[PDB]
Amino acid sequence: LQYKKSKRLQEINERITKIKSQVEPYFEFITPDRWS
Amino acid sequence: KRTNETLRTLVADLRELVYEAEDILVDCQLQYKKSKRLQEINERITKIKSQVEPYFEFITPDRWS
Amino acid sequence: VVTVFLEKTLNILEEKGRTVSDYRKQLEDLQSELKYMQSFLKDAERQ
Numbered sequence: 823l824q825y826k827k828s829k830r831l832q833e834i835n836e837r838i839t840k841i842k843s844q845v846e847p848y849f850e851f852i853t854p855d856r857w858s
Numbered sequence: 859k860r861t862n863e864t865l866r867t868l869v870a871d872l873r874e875l876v877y878e879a880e881d882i883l884v885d886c887q888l889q890y891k892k893s894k895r896l897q898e899i900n901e902r903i904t905k906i907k908s909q910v911e912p913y914f915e916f917i918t919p920d921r922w923s
Numbered sequence: 924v925v926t927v928f929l930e931k932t933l934n935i936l937e938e939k940g941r942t943v944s945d946y947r948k949q950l951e952d953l954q955s956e957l958k959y960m961q962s963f964l965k966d967a968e969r970q
Binding site: 823824825827828829831832834835838 | 939942943945946949950952953956960
Binding site: 839842843845846849850853854 | 909912915916918
C-alpha cells in the first residue's frame with residue numbers, strides 16, 4: 823500500500839514546516855581579524 | 859550579482875514554472891477540467907513560495923588591468 | 924442507534940481514500956524541500 827509511506831511523508835513534512843514556522847520569528851526579532 | 863545558491867535554485871525552478879504556466883494559459887482562448895488545472899498550478903506556485911521564503915528569512919547577506 | 928457508527932465507518936473509509944491520492948504530491952513536496960534545505964545548509968556554512 824501507499825498508505826504507510828504517505829503518512830510517513832505527512833509526518834516528516836509537517837515537522838519540517840512546524841520547525842520553520844516556530845524558528846522564523848526569532849530571526850524576525852533581532853537584526854545583526856588575523857594578522858602577523 | 860553575488861548571489862547565493864538558494865536564489866539560483868529558486869530562479870531555476872521559477873523558470874520551469876513560467877514555462878508550464880504560460881503553457882497551460884494558452885488553452886484559455888466544460889470549464890471543469892481547465893479550472894482544476896488552474897487550481898493545481900496555482901497551488902503549486904503558492905506552496906513553492908511559502909516553503910522557500912523562510913530560508914531567505916533566516917540568513918542575511920572586481921576585474922582590472 | 925445503529926447508523927451513526929457505520930456512517931462514521933463510512934467517513935473513516937473516505938478519509939483512508941483521501942490519504943492515498945496525494946502520495947505523489949507529498950513525494951514531490953519532500954524532494955523539493957530536501958533540495959532547498961541542502962542549498963540552505965550549503966549557503967549557511969559560508970557566513
